[PDB]
Amino acid sequence: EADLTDWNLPLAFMKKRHCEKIEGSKSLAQSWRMKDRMKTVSVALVLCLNVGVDPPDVVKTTPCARLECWIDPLSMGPQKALETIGANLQKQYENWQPRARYKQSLDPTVDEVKKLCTSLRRNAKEERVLFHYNGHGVPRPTVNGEVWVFNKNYTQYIPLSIYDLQTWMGSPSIFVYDCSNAGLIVKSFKQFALQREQELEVSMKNCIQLAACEATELLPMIPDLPADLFTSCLTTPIKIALRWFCMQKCVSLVPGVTLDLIEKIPGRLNDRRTPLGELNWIFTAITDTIAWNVLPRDLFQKLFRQDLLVASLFRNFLLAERIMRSYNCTPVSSPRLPPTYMHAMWQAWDLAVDICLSQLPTIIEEGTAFRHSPFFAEQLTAFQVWLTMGVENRNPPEQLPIVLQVLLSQVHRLRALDLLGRFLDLGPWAVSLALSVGIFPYVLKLLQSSARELRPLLVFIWAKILAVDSSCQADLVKDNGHKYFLSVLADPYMPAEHRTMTAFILAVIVNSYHTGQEACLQGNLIAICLEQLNDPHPLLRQWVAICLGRIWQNFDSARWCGVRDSAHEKLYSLLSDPIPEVRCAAVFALGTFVGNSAERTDHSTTIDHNVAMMLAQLVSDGSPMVRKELVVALSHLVVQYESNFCTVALQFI
């Protein structure tokens, strides 16, 4: 048949340079950058425990709930117990924020609270200050916006107005109320907030508030649970999470798992290779995933990315909402969250816990080696399955924040870096998402690694990022990540495909940025580039030449290094290259080289005339794309000798 002749024919003038316009893509408004980083400088632990005394409003049951901060107060005697709970509570908070000035107040007066809050505001006027209030020992807050403390003698409950309490504390602050009708405080706090706004004409968004309960609701009296149910959730999530898991009906499915085995669970909360550190790591992933899927992007970056401690509190708040719901309790937040209790990911958390502490009989008694959870593996498997048919702009993958959490270890780091690159490839919309979830500071931290297996993956990931957001050139120079890539560009064994991406990354870092031009010049880029200038790959030859042109753009020091290496001579070879992309890139670099002469020694003028005549023999060229850059290149010649070209122009008139 006469079809093999048709299919086997070059379609002339049908390529990217012809069909598409030679125009730069308009950069979108990259809003991923965080506006500011908050720092919780100090913490106020106001504890109205009233150990050994029962509040008159609530008639406690005989068993009641005794545990406070995982300490039986009646075991230690009244006074010591109050000091001990304050010490433990500090430690618990120091798990999440170890670098903050703690100052306990134990059954305080009003003056005592005034001097305490005013001092912490003086220390950090412009920074967030945490106010923790535990009113289990005082009567319930009133409708009139008041909170109870004691008198000097501990003979009368003195009320304290929320207005005056929010007077002494400043604008950036966060309030945690762990009492029974805690909703009343939040209502009256917002009232006095509105009342201040009305007085201001002739501190609301800044003030965060967490509350254990709704104004109508009461705290649970159940002897199995600790009395400090809310604070424990916020400050020791894994501890109550396992105790609550052992209280549900789903324990029948795993016989031989009592609370006593949970007490003696091995490990720590830091070591992710231990059983306890595994759950804490999984929990951090699950909570950060629920938040990203449920909350609107704006409010997520406000609470879960700005500062660590707030993000940790809201992460653990989501667990409180779920647990307390099961006892006719609704926690309350000032920026109202939509109900997450019914999210699918919570079911995954149960299974993850189940598999992790089904091994505990064998780990404790038999001494079996703790096998790690398949959780992170299976979640990466789900993300991979999504990518298979992920071309369309459908709902984003739920597992994106888990991929971030996986990058923190080494066990699954290779697989995650692969998948993350494949995702970024899908399009610039996806790279925007991955930057909004907050991948940047972790991908940048991996540039401190020396594992050469990472080198092809990081080169890929960074090319996609810098293609979208070119402002990240600032960050890469600060952390000396440009050295990581310089090494990859001087490695003959690295494939030429990944070396091409590296030359682009460098051509972005250097682009119109004197700090990056001065930094790459000192890292000896021009010498490295010339070593790769004669490769058998037309994509590399093109970019290496653009990269060479950008480094000496209005930077005479990089030009002088080119003069010593005699780059302009080695670039004339690219002027006769088959591929018209390379020829054009070559004309670009030779033009930018000429443009920054800045009236140097006579040598420069003879070189500029040598570079001129070598360019002046690219007039009869087929591609107009090259001839266009040839003009811009000859523009640099006119700019340098504007006084001289006026002499020639006036002659022939």
């Binding site: 005339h609 001129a612 005549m613 002046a616 007039v619 107009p624 001839r627 266009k628 040839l630 003009v631 811009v632 000859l634 523009s635 010649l637 006119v638 000798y641 504007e642 001289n644 070209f645 006026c646 002499t647 020639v648 122009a649």
Partner: protein, 34 residues
């Protein structure tokens, strides 16, 4: 030398392709008035 490069710019000024002729004309006219 400048005579040669000005003659080159004359070829780019009379380009068949419009975009190249336009940009070459701008740069060539930006000399005249200086």
């Amino acid at each position: 030398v400048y005579t040669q490069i000005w003659r080159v710019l004359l070829h780019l000024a009379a380009d068949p392709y419009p975009e190249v002729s336009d940009v070459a004309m701008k740069v060539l006219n930006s000399i005249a008035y200086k």
